[PDB]
Symmetry: C2
Subunit: 104 residues, 2 copies
């Protein structure tokens, strides 16, 4: 529980941080780097993006509990967004909502 | 071996990325965020910074092998730099050398 959640939290936080402090002119280039080089796909999150939860198997819900405690109670953790499989974790910068998608 | 190394690689890569694409005016502020919020201390690496290897115990050398395969053959991995304990991993942006220090 704790260990997996800690790693996922670290990834989301470092990714959000990279975006937060990014040179606005290089922000699109940064998103390409994160995806290709770090395997981290960032997307804007639209209010109408649909999602499906990870199953209640193994320690998923405990992992999810620990992630929200560290990232924020309103964090969405999902196994798909708009029918696209992955490990999906939402985050925010100010008024802007985002997804991070990782490979399962 | 693989798993620990993969996580450390991810941290170093995301950290380097954040720095690489950072707004130059916010770069010092970014370093504060990484340290306080992500527990990642970045330092410039000076050619005369001394270091001490992690012991050859457990799977340390295998972890180190996997880290270098992903980050670069010239990567230094150390248990201390200038007598300061931690998990230290070097990285570069162009001509500039850096350390990342994590808690053990
Ligand atoms: Ba909290
Ligand atoms: Ba919003
Ligand atoms: Ba809002
Ligand atoms: Ba809202
Ligand atoms: Ba919004
Ligand atoms: Ba290589
Ligand atoms: Ba140099
Ligand atoms: Ba050099
Ligand atoms: Ba050199
Ligand atoms: Ba140098
Ligand atoms: Cl953008
Ligand atoms: Cl979905
Ligand atoms: Cl600087
Ligand atoms: Cl040392």
């Amino acid at each position: 529980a704790q260990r997996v959640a800690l790693q996922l939290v670290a990834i989301v936080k470092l990714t959000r941080t990279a975006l937060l402090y990014s040179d606005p002119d290089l922000r699109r280039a940064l998103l390409q780097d994160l995806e290709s080089n770090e395997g981290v796909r960032v997307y804007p999150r639209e209010k109408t993006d649909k999602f499906k939860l990870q199953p209640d198997e193994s320690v998923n819900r405990l992992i999810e509990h620990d992630i929200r405690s560290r990232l924020g109670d309103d964090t969405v953790i999902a196994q798909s967004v708009n029918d696209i499989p992955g490990v999906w974790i939402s985050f925010k910068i100010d008024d802007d909502d985002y997804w991070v998608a990782l490979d399962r």
